[PDB]
C-alpha cells in the first residue's frame, strides 16, 4: 500500500446540490483510492455507495466535563457553620455580658 | 455466511452481588474523625497538660 492523505480533509459528506461526494468517500466512489483506513463512521447514506468492513472500534456519544479535584478546605474552615457577623457579634455580646 | 452490520455492541463484563450495606465494626465509633485527628488529639492533650 501507499498512504496518501485526503487533500480535502473531510471525512465524507454529500453536498446535496451537485451530489458530488467530497472527502474519503468521494476518493473511493470516483476511482481514486482502493482502501480507506480512517475513522470513517458507518452510516446508511455512505453504505449506498461503498461497502464498509466490520467495525474495528465501537464508540458513541459521551459527555466530557472539566476534571474536578480536592477543595483544599481552608485553614480556618471550622467557622463556616456560622456567618462572619454572628462570630463578630458573639465577641461583642461576650464583652458586654461580662 | 454474511453477517450484517451489528445491531448492538456488547462485551465481557463483571457481575457481582450488590453491596448489601456493611456489617459494623468493634471500634467503629472512631469513624467520623480520621486516624490523624485522633492521633493529634492525644498529642495536644499531652502538650496542654
Amino acid at each position: 500500500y501507499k498512504i496518501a492523505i485526503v487533500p480535502d480533509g473531510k471525512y465524507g459528506a454529500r453536498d446535496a446540490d451537485t451530489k458530488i461526494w467530497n472527502g474519503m468517500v468521494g476518493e473511493l466512489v470516483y476511482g481514486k483510492a482502493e482502501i480507506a483506513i480512517a475513522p470513517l463512521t458507518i452510516t446508511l447514506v455512505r453504505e449506498e455507495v461503498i461497502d464498509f468492513s466490520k467495525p474495528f472500534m465501537s464508540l458513541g456519544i459521551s459527555i466530557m466535563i472539566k476534571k474536578p479535584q480536592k477543595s483544599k478546605p481552608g485553614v480556618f474552615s471550622f467557622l463556616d457553620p456560622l456567618a462572619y457577623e454572628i462570630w463578630m457579634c458573639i465577641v461583642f455580646a461576650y464583652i458586654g455580658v461580662s | 455466511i454474511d453477517f450484517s452490520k451489528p445491531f448492538m455492541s456488547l462485551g465481557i463484563s463483571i457481575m457481582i452481588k450488590k453491596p448489601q450495606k456493611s456489617k459494623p465494626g468493634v471500634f467503629s465509633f472512631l469513624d467520623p474523625l480520621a486516624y490523624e485527628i485522633w492521633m493529634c488529639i492525644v498529642f495536644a492533650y499531652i502538650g496542654v497538660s
Binding site: 480536592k70 483544599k72 | 490523624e36 493529634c40 498529642f43 495536644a44 502538650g47
Partner: protein, 54 residues
Amino acid sequence: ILSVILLFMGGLCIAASEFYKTRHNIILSAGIFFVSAGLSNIIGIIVYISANAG
C-alpha cells in the same frame, strides 16, 4: 528542624547546670526548651500531614 535545634539547646542547658550549680535558672531554661521543642514538633506533624494531603 526547630525542634531538633531546641532539644539540642536543652541538652546544653542541662549540661551547663552540671558545672554551675549556683545558677538555678539554667534548669528552668532546659525545661522550657524541651517543652517548646515538643510544641514545635506538633506543628511539624500537622503541617506535614496537612500539606501532604493537598
